[PDB]
């Protein structure tokens, strides 16, 4: 079975491009990472940095998570990210997304041993 760590990688990691994200990026990426299979996932962020760099965030700035948990960590550096947000006219199974590239600090929740990202919380 897929570990929480592997699920984070599937849902939130895209090291292959620096930013590129054509206007079509989210439409394609959300489908293939199986984020559209059962419903259209409303909001989802992909991070364009190395896995080691995103894993390192788990030892960076400890911040409160949105749900009140204490295991969130904010990256010291900005990172290349793409936000995918479902459009108003998007109709499952034809999931449609607006693609927005940005350079922001990421906030992830980390768990386990090894202590690794398991949830994408926010960007700031
Ligand atoms: O900037 C964000 C905010 C939320 N999410 C995803 O949306 C899910 C649900 O978010 P929320 O509606 O609980 O904020 C999160 O678990 C996370 O996967 C992102 O990818 N990026
Ligand atoms: O603030 C949070 C939110 C979620 N999770 C964990 O992240 C994983 C994926 O949750 P989600 O991003 O699908 O909500 C789960 O194992 C959940 O317990 C946290 O550790 N902290």
Curated annotation (Swiss-Prot):
Glycans are attached at residues 1, 7, 34, 37, 41. Substrate binds at residues 7, 10, 41-45, 66, 85. Keywords: Disulfide bond, Endonuclease, Glycation, Glycoprotein, Hydrolase, Lyase, Nuclease, Secreted, Signal. Disulfide bonds join 26-84, 40-95, 58-110, 65-72. Its EC number is 4.6.1.18. It catalyses: an [RNA] containing cytidine + H2O = an [RNA]-3'-cytidine-3'-phosphate + a 5'-hydroxy-ribonucleotide-3'-[RNA]; an [RNA] containing uridine + H2O = an [RNA]-3'-uridine-3'-phosphate + a 5'-hydroxy-ribonucleotide-3'-[RNA]. The keyword Lyase applies. Changing residue 119 to A: Loss of activity. GO terms for molecular function: lyase activity; nucleic acid binding; ribonuclease A activity; RNA nuclease activity. It is found in: Secreted. GO terms for cellular component: extracellular region. GO terms for biological process: defense response to Gram-positive bacterium. The active site is at residues 12, 119. Pancreas. Interacts with and forms tight 1:1 complexes with RNH1. Dimerization of two such complexes may occur. Interaction with RNH1 inhibits this protein. Monomer. Endonuclease that catalyzes the cleavage of RNA on the 3' side of pyrimidine nucleotides. Acts on single-stranded and double-stranded RNA. Belongs to the pancreatic ribonuclease family. This is Ribonuclease pancreatic. It comes from Bos taurus (Bovine). The gene is RNASE1.
């Amino acid at each position: 079975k897929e570990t929480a760590a592997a699920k984070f990688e599937r849902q939130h990691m895209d090291s292959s491009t620096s930013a590129a994200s054509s206007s079509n990026y989210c439409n394609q990426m959300m489908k293939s990472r199986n984020l559209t299979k059962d419903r259209c996932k409303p909001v989802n962020t992909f991070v364009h940095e190395s896995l080691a760099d995103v894993q390192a965030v788990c030892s960076q700035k400890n911040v409160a998570c949105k749900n009140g948990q204490t295991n969130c960590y904010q990256s010291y550096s900005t990172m290349s990210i793409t936000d995918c947000r479902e459009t108003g006219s998007s109709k499952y199974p034809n999931c449609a997304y607006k693609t927005t590239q940005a350079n922001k600090h990421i906030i992830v929740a980390c768990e386990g041993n090894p202590y690794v990202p398991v949830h994408f919380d926010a960007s700031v």
